[PDB]
């Protein structure tokens, strides 16, 4: 799976980018700094369950 | 001068066979999915995906 696409939804969610524009190295590089970063606590356990 | 008993040989072969020339059309390759290709450290070749 490549998360281009959920990158993509997020910046298009984000509302005020051009994703059209944003050259798919820049998603990847969001996508890594995404990754470090800690789940939220309901979503987390509602994975885990 | 013709002499019979010195001209009369016994010539040796073979009774057939098949002579082939392309040597790899008897080889059926294929080729694993192209997303999931390892380099020769047995890692995909392209992980930023």
Redesign the interface.
Known sequence: ???KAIVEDFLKRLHIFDVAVAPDDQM?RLRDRLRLLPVEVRRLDIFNL | QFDFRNSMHMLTSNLTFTVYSDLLAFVSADTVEPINAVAFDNMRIMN??
């Open positions: 799976k490549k998360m990847y | 930023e995906l």
